[PDB]
Amino acid sequence: GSSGSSGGTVKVYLPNKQRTVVTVRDGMSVYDSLDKALKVRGLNQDCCVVYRLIKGRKTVTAWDTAIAPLDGEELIVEVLSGPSSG
């Protein structure tokens, strides 16, 4: 959404129709990053997924992955759920 803000942070969209701004570090991973983002609610990196904003497409992300290559972007943290098949 309209947000004319440019600095050293990132917006994290939680599944709790909520969002949290985190600091962009060049070392930590997405897990250690979204870690709190989850704990804050009590979520876990087991039944949760993070989507990246690419050309307006939720591109799943890895936990082991780094958060360095995430300068100026937004991730969507959701809970793994849905009818796989059937």
XYZ file of C-alpha atoms in Angstrom:
86
model
C 0.000 0.000 0.000
C 0.965 3.625 -0.497
C 4.040 4.075 1.664
C 6.603 6.649 0.602
C 9.317 5.507 2.979
C 12.913 4.682 2.136
C 15.504 3.668 4.701
C 17.094 0.587 6.218
C 14.132 -1.592 7.112
C 11.669 -4.108 5.724
C 7.955 -4.703 6.140
C 6.819 -8.142 7.237
C 3.229 -9.188 6.653
C 2.014 -11.656 9.253
C -0.943 -14.016 8.798
C -2.593 -12.170 11.660
C -3.641 -9.433 9.266
C -0.764 -7.625 10.931
C 2.612 -6.299 9.849
C 5.977 -5.695 11.476
C 8.967 -3.664 10.353
C 12.373 -5.267 10.739
C 15.920 -4.050 10.212
C 17.810 -5.032 7.084
C 21.018 -6.752 8.117
C 23.779 -8.176 5.954
C 24.459 -11.422 7.778
C 21.429 -12.843 9.548
C 19.057 -15.168 7.734
C 15.335 -15.042 7.062
C 14.656 -17.457 9.896
C 16.528 -15.524 12.558
C 14.732 -12.553 11.049
C 11.163 -13.767 10.722
C 11.912 -15.675 13.903
C 10.576 -12.984 16.204
C 8.085 -11.930 13.556
C 6.618 -15.318 14.389
C 7.328 -15.616 18.095
C 5.725 -12.210 18.483
C 2.596 -14.188 17.694
C 3.830 -17.654 18.588
C 4.102 -18.931 15.035
C 6.801 -21.366 13.977
C 8.976 -22.110 10.971
C 7.294 -25.478 10.578
C 3.746 -24.667 9.541
C 4.528 -21.234 8.153
C 5.833 -19.927 4.850
C 7.293 -16.661 3.615
C 6.490 -15.210 0.213
C 8.556 -12.641 -1.647
C 7.254 -9.765 -3.734
C 8.548 -10.249 -7.257
C 6.803 -8.385 -10.052
C 3.764 -8.688 -7.815
C 4.024 -12.409 -7.171
C 4.266 -14.223 -3.859
C 7.477 -16.153 -4.390
C 7.991 -18.606 -1.554
C 11.273 -18.165 0.279
C 13.671 -20.381 2.194
C 14.478 -20.130 5.883
C 18.150 -20.960 5.486
C 18.295 -18.246 2.853
C 19.828 -14.915 3.794
C 18.017 -11.652 4.428
C 20.859 -9.619 2.974
C 19.511 -9.886 -0.580
C 16.252 -8.319 0.537
C 17.028 -4.625 0.264
C 13.798 -2.765 -0.400
C 11.075 -5.392 -0.495
C 8.316 -7.109 1.446
C 7.751 -10.674 2.586
C 4.461 -12.344 3.429
C 4.473 -14.774 6.331
C 1.566 -17.195 6.224
C 0.603 -20.457 7.887
C 0.991 -23.663 5.915
C -2.558 -24.854 5.359
C -4.961 -25.904 2.630
C -6.298 -29.002 0.861
C -3.194 -30.345 -0.836
C -5.290 -32.639 -2.995
C -8.940 -33.446 -2.404
